[PDB]
Design an enzyme around this catalytic site. Sequence first.
Site, PDB file in Angstrom:
ATOM      1  N   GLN A   1       0.825  -1.202   0.000  1.00 36.91           N
ATOM      2  CA  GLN A   1       0.000   0.000   0.000  1.00 36.91           C
ATOM      3  C   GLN A   1       0.862   1.256   0.000  1.00 36.91           C
ATOM      4  O   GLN A   1       0.693   2.141  -0.847  1.00 36.91           O
ATOM      5  CB  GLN A   1      -0.942  -0.019   1.204  1.00 36.91           C
ATOM      6  CG  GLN A   1      -1.777   1.234   1.374  1.00 36.91           C
ATOM      7  CD  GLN A   1      -2.610   1.200   2.640  1.00 36.91           C
ATOM      8  OE1 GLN A   1      -3.337   0.240   2.894  1.00 36.91           O
ATOM      9  NE2 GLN A   1      -2.494   2.244   3.452  1.00 36.91           N
TER      10      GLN A   1
ATOM     11  N   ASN B   1       8.113   7.972   9.099  1.00 32.32           N
ATOM     12  CA  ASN B   1       6.778   8.556   9.070  1.00 32.32           C
ATOM     13  C   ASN B   1       6.601   9.628  10.137  1.00 32.32           C
ATOM     14  O   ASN B   1       5.866  10.599   9.927  1.00 32.32           O
ATOM     15  CB  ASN B   1       5.722   7.464   9.249  1.00 32.32           C
ATOM     16  CG  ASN B   1       5.124   7.000   7.934  1.00 32.32           C
ATOM     17  OD1 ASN B   1       5.182   7.706   6.927  1.00 32.32           O
ATOM     18  ND2 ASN B   1       4.526   5.811   7.943  1.00 32.32           N
TER      19      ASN B   1
ATOM     20  N   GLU C   1      25.905   6.261  -9.898  1.00 29.00           N
ATOM     21  CA  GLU C   1      26.503   7.424  -9.247  1.00 29.00           C
ATOM     22  C   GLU C   1      26.012   7.588  -7.816  1.00 29.00           C
ATOM     23  O   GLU C   1      26.754   8.089  -6.965  1.00 29.00           O
ATOM     24  CB  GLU C   1      26.217   8.695 -10.050  1.00 29.00           C
ATOM     25  CG  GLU C   1      26.999   8.789 -11.351  1.00 29.00           C
ATOM     26  CD  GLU C   1      27.119  10.212 -11.875  1.00 29.00           C
ATOM     27  OE1 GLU C   1      26.894  11.163 -11.095  1.00 29.00           O
ATOM     28  OE2 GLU C   1      27.443  10.378 -13.071  1.00 29.00           O
TER      29      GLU C   1
HETATM   30  N1  LIG Z   1       4.024   7.642   4.125  1.00 32.99           N
HETATM   31  C1  LIG Z   1       3.107   6.696   3.945  1.00 32.99           C
HETATM   32  N2  LIG Z   1       3.116   5.580   4.757  1.00 32.99           N
HETATM   33  C2  LIG Z   1       2.194   4.595   4.599  1.00 32.99           C
HETATM   34  C3  LIG Z   1       1.222   4.697   3.615  1.00 32.99           C
HETATM   35  N3  LIG Z   1       0.445   3.591   3.683  1.00 32.99           N
HETATM   36  C4  LIG Z   1       0.902   2.797   4.678  1.00 32.99           C
HETATM   37  N4  LIG Z   1       1.975   3.413   5.267  1.00 32.99           N
HETATM   38  C5  LIG Z   1       2.792   2.884   6.373  1.00 32.99           C
HETATM   39  O1  LIG Z   1       3.094   1.546   6.045  1.00 32.99           O
HETATM   40  C6  LIG Z   1       3.066   0.720   7.188  1.00 32.99           C
HETATM   41  C7  LIG Z   1       2.077  -0.412   6.945  1.00 32.99           C
HETATM   42  O2  LIG Z   1       2.457  -1.096   5.771  1.00 32.99           O
HETATM   43  P1  LIG Z   1       1.494  -1.218   4.487  1.00 32.99           P
HETATM   44  O3  LIG Z   1       2.204  -0.666   3.277  1.00 32.99           O
HETATM   45  O4  LIG Z   1       0.174  -0.527   4.719  1.00 32.99           O
HETATM   46  O5  LIG Z   1       1.274  -2.807   4.385  1.00 32.99           O
HETATM   47  P2  LIG Z   1       1.432  -3.665   3.033  1.00 32.99           P
HETATM   48  O6  LIG Z   1       2.756  -3.392   2.365  1.00 32.99           O
HETATM   49  O7  LIG Z   1       0.273  -3.398   2.106  1.00 32.99           O
HETATM   50  O8  LIG Z   1       1.440  -5.184   3.568  1.00 32.99           O
HETATM   51  P3  LIG Z   1       0.107  -5.943   4.068  1.00 32.99           P
HETATM   52  O9  LIG Z   1      -1.084  -5.018   4.088  1.00 32.99           O
HETATM   53  O10 LIG Z   1       0.339  -6.479   5.459  1.00 32.99           O
HETATM   54  O11 LIG Z   1      -0.181  -7.096   3.143  1.00 32.99           O
HETATM   55  C8  LIG Z   1       2.672   1.596   8.357  1.00 32.99           C
HETATM   56  O12 LIG Z   1       3.842   1.979   9.042  1.00 32.99           O
HETATM   57  C9  LIG Z   1       2.067   2.818   7.710  1.00 32.99           C
HETATM   58  O13 LIG Z   1       2.288   3.956   8.511  1.00 32.99           O
HETATM   59  C10 LIG Z   1       1.208   5.820   2.792  1.00 32.99           C
HETATM   60  O14 LIG Z   1       0.349   5.915   1.919  1.00 32.99           O
HETATM   61  N5  LIG Z   1       2.150   6.822   2.956  1.00 32.99           N
HETATM   62 MG   LIG Z   2      -1.726  -3.687   2.796  1.00 35.80          MG
END
Ligand SMILES: Nc1nc2c(ncn2[C@@H]2O[C@H](COP(=O)(O)OP(=O)(O)OP(=O)(O)O)[C@@H](O)[C@H]2O)c(=O)[nH]1
Ligand SMILES: [Mg+2]
Lengths: 256, 424, 55, 437
Positions: free
Chosen positions: D11, D206, D254
């Site tokens: 995500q 974050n 680089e």
């Molecule tokens: N900066 C930022 N951080 C994000 C975002 N979405 C999720 N996070 C961070 O990502 C972490 C959670 O991981 P996700 O990327 O949501 O999980 P995933 O990679 O989809 O893996 P699963 O859902 O468990 O299958 C948390 O620390 C969130 O704060 C985003 O859109 N922007």
């Molecule tokens: Mg996810």
Amino acid sequence: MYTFVVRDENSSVYAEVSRLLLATGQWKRLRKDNPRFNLMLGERNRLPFGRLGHEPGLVQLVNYYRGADKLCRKASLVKLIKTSPELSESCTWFPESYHVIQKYLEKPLLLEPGHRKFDIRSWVLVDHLYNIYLYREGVLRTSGNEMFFEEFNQYLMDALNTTLENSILLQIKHIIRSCLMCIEPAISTKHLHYQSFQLFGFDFMVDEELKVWLIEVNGAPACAQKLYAELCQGIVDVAISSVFPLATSIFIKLHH
Amino acid sequence: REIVHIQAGQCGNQIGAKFWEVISDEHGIDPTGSYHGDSDLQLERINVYYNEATGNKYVPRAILVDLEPGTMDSVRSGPFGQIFRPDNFVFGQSGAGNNWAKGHYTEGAELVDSVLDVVRKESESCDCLQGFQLTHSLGGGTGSGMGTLLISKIREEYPDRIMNTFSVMPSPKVSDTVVEPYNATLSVHQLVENTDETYCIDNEALYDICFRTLKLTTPTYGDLNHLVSATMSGVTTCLRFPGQLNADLRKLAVNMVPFPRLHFFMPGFAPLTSRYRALTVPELTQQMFDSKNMMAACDPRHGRYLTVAAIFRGRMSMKEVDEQMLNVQNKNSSYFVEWIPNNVKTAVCDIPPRGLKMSATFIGNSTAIQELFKRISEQFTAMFRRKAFLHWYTGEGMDEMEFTEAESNMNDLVSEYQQYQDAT
Amino acid sequence: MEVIELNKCTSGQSFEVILKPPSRDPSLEEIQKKLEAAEERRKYQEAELLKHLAE
Amino acid sequence: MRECISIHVGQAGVQIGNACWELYCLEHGIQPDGQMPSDKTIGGGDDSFNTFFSETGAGKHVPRAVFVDLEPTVIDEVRTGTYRQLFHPEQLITGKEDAANNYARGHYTIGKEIIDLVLDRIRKLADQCTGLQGFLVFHSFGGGTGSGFTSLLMERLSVDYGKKSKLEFSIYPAPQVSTAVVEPYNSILTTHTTLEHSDCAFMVDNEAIYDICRRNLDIERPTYTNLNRLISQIVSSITASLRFDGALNVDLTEFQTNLVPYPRIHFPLATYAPVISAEKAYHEQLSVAEITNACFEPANQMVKCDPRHGKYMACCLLYRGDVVPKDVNAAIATIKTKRSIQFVDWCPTGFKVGINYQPPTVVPGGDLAKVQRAVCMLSNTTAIAEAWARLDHKFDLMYAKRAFVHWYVGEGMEEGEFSEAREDMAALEKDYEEVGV
Ligand SMILES: Nc1nc2c(ncn2[C@@H]2O[C@H](COP(=O)(O)OP(=O)(O)OP(=O)(O)O)[C@@H](O)[C@H]2O)c(=O)[nH]1
Ligand SMILES: [Mg+2]
Ligand SMILES: Nc1nc2c(ncn2[C@@H]2O[C@H](COP(=O)(O)OP(=O)(O)O)[C@@H](O)[C@H]2O)c(=O)[nH]1
Ligand SMILES: CCNc1nc(N2CC(=O)Nc3cc(OC)ccc32)c2ncccc2n1
Ligand SMILES: [Ca+2]
Ligand SMILES: [Ca+2]
Ligand SMILES: [Cl-]
Ligand SMILES: [Mg+2]
């Protein structure tokens, strides 16, 4: 209520601070490893600065300055004096040095009767805003066995026709101001995610011409028993409650 | 990602039926099954609990099970009884006589393969099945004995999906038989092994809340179920509605359950209401953690929270929500374990439950939950020491050792909940 | 302070500034091996479950 | 034109990928339908923006990107969003059920089912590259997909493209926005698995980005949309060297030779400035000296730490806007006198500077104001080892009780992979300390 932890139980100074804080009825003590604290009274060795200021919704204050070691280990102190442009050749108050090897004061001022040698210790406190506070009460470790400033002053008047402020204290306020302004960019926490205060113990010696010299700086000083009560309340008032307010001035603000 | 709901017994079918009434109103689904709601948010994740049908009517993905015909006929005579798929009614005539053995071994064995066939037909329709959801009571015969049997057989056919139960604990304050400690201890043995997450709805706590808080001098079962349907609506909010947290059953289990057997959650709700002033976010938070709002008769100050999940519903400042949630942890940091960092997770949903404009639901995995298992273990032993009423079970083929195995497995569970209450 | 290697373009400039001077690939087999050793451990503990449920 | 493939995992990766490619389209004048009127070369070209965009015979510019999520809900809004026409449907890849915040579930269980699918659709992109530089990978440490599936992908990209270089943009977990309680577990595991397969990794905490949006943009409760549009500004200025004409950081190699002298210590600390609110009616345009000064203030960094108690190994300053060279050399002069900048002895004390004249582009209607000059400083300081110490301490609190371990071994992982990955991090912390003391 505000929360605090204590991670240096061997600290006579901050033990009394812990007592007064709890006695407020507005501070409560947590377990050492409980992260959700406002104030840390941390350890002397390898204090984990890297983990402070990361708990959401908590303003965190610690009683030590990361980087103050550069002034409190005599190896670092001599390196700091020689290399620092803000000091260097201009120091007429640091004995020539290269433990470590320093010159000896051939001509100490001798309190009499009894031909007595001495060193002077004043306690300085630096709050989270880097205001420098010199405790009006100092003490001479004479060779109880401790002379305080009222006696030493009256001795100076009746023995040498001058006062403690003019003869010695002026130089002391200059030395304290000089070292702490030097490392201020290196250790200030003014725009950090956590804040620092620290109590310092400066040690001075006076030669036979009433010139003051800096022996060493101590980053974790003890106090004299007579004075524990007044200084520890000032730490709470000026350094702790300044950040966490509750529901005369024993200090002299050194201006910069 | 669909959920299959199963309700077993008198208690399971009654709390289950109120649950479907409550959420059908929130999603704007009427007893005929047709939709009449203002927001398309109500239809976005409706597939979790409802099946779309011809004429764009929605049919709950629910299986109704009992060994007596009576409770099922009352659900069909209820307001929303028409909404349930007629084939999904699976019942028999013999009854279980408040006897765990009759539901688990003898009378229940005949009906179980029929229920599993309805499960299978619903499961095959599902695009992606999260898992299953069971409402039952631990003190009867059908929900306690046949419910834990179905769980055992659902796990065999669907080993990879999640099993979640709402389990109602017995209490002498609201009791049917003296053998309720026998039925509850036997069931808890099963739930420890074969569920991923169990909400402990304690009838003692529901009675006390009705008595001393809501000032109802003698509560009906409907009075208790009003508290249950509120809690059941509050804890499924993040499954039915789009929010900042789009949640499922597995992610809840992964984050709430630090050790596989410690999966018994204390529900809590605020504000407690009997069957116009709205609560400020600070009030919601203070009450939600208040022991007087827990759905399990346990003192949370006698334990420590391992994990906590909290839901806020209505229109409120999410800023004030997390200022207040952080305030409770920072102010009571003793009651949260220091070896699980950041073990409190909050979610916010804009749609409040009917009647209230602001609400807070609490899901706690607290080690104080062992007060509930001690109480049931104390009542059990008082009888079992003298083998009282045991002939009603040995006459159905059980052995005394199976009671010994359940007693000690539950007493292990209490000691395990105490291990972590003191670990540092 | 010296300035070194100024390269200009229509889009921008690049240079360096100096103030003080100085003083085994894991094989597809190995990752597929451990990827399958984890799946065998998975299906072992599932078998143990389906046999605990058969008893 | 040596080309660059972007991969967005999970995500966090997909939505940050959304932020950048939206910004890239504004910075290059590409409309959401893929058309570029500035481009008169129809259907081809060796321009510098073709390192990131391919061209169709219909004049469409399509990202050299692939999106991967084991769950469809997040990539589906890319499929129906404003830039839906931008991507070919094949480069958007989705599974059925996600990794449930479980590293092992994303790596082993669900990873093995989909690993070959994406490597095929990656190689479809690489076959369209006359000279592939490498890959830009965007993911979170805490997500099960972002940690587990990425580290499997990084493993198999090293085998199939061992010559090409892999750059990583990673979201470091912060409790104020974290979704899972086990994110320290996933972080230590994915870092250990990916360490020797990533040539350079930019961490973004974050919490740092959160408090920048609170402090400087005056947002009481920032969302992911806020964070990402800030994050993309940093990502855009880091990748600006590859998409425009430059001499500094023109190829992914680089980034290593400029910033990474030690292969394991490949985590540069990024600092960006200025961050100005769009609601601020009239903003004093900050000088070159003021925005170069800000790069040494901890409050503007992507990771909260104090470089004053570490040591630098490298330092780049990437200026975007009205910046003249002798403007920055005067600002470098004044700040070296008033700040604690200790390079390691075996490295020269200095800066590599690139200036791109085109000012930063912001999203119209966004909450970032347009400024006339901005700077992003990439600096490999040892003070970043604090972020590891924090993450490791959290890992150590849970693992002593073995809390939540069963969810991992239940997916076929071995309990020893935890302590293996943990003493890799214990080694990484000492390697940092030896360099910086
Ligand atoms: N900066 C930022 N951080 C994000 C975002 N979405 C999720 N996070 C961070 O990502 C972490 C959670 O991981 P996700 O990327 O949501 O999980 P995933 O990679 O989809 O893996 P699963 O859902 O468990 O299958 C948390 O620390 C969130 O704060 C985003 O859109 N922007
Ligand atoms: Mg996810
Ligand atoms: N809260 C609640 N508890 C119930 C209800 N009906 C029965 N119980 C409790 O459940 C237990 C009896 O189980 P029951 O469902 O009646 O028997 P079963 O049909 O054989 O499972 C007793 O402890 C009752 O106090 C109900 O509607 N609500
Ligand atoms: C069954 C509904 N599902 C669900 N799930 C939640 N989750 C899943 C998740 O992703 N993270 C998470 C982390 C936690 O840490 C202590 C606790 C819980 C969760 C959740 N949280 C808060 C309120 C409601 C919630 N409802
Ligand atoms: Ca059959
Ligand atoms: Ca072209
Ligand atoms: Cl700024
Ligand atoms: Mg009955």
